[PDB]
Amino acid sequence: AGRIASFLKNAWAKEPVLVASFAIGGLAIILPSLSPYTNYAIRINRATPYNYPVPLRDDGNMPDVPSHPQDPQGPSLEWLKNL
Template identity: 65%
Template sequence: MAPLRNIAAFLKNAWAKEPVIVTSFAIGIGALLLPWVSPVAHYQTKMNRAVPLQYPVPLRDDNNMPDIPSHPCEKIGPSLEWMKRL
C-alpha cells in the first residue's frame, strides 16, 4: 500500500504544479497502450496476414504446370473467410 500512496502523492503533486505535462504523458501512455487492447488491432493483424506482400506475376498456362495456381487467390494460406462471417 505504501508504494501506491507514494505514486498517488507524486501524481497529485505533479498535477497541481504542471497539469499540461501530466496530461501529455497520460495521452502518450494511452497512445502506446491502445493498439494492444483495441479489438480493431486484432482484425487488422488478421487482414495484414491474409494479404500477400508481393503479388504474383501472371503466367500463361499451358496446362503443364500443376503446382502453380491459375489464380492468385488459390494459394495456400490464410484467407478472408472470417471477414465475410462478421
C-alpha cells in the first residue's frame, strides 16, 4: 500500500521511461481479454472469402443451405454493415 506507493514514486522520479514501458506492456497483455470486440475481430477475419465457396451436391435433406446467394438461408453480414 505505502511501500508500493513509495517504490512507484521513486521509479517515476528516476526511470519514467521504464514505468511507461511496463504500464503499456501490462495494458497490452491485460486489456484484450476484457474486450467485447475481440469476438468481432475474429468474426471479421472469418467473413473474408479468400477462396471460392464450392457448392454442395443437393440430396434433398439440407433445409439450412441456400440454393441461391439471395436466398434467406446461410450466414449474413448484416451485423458488419452497422459495425
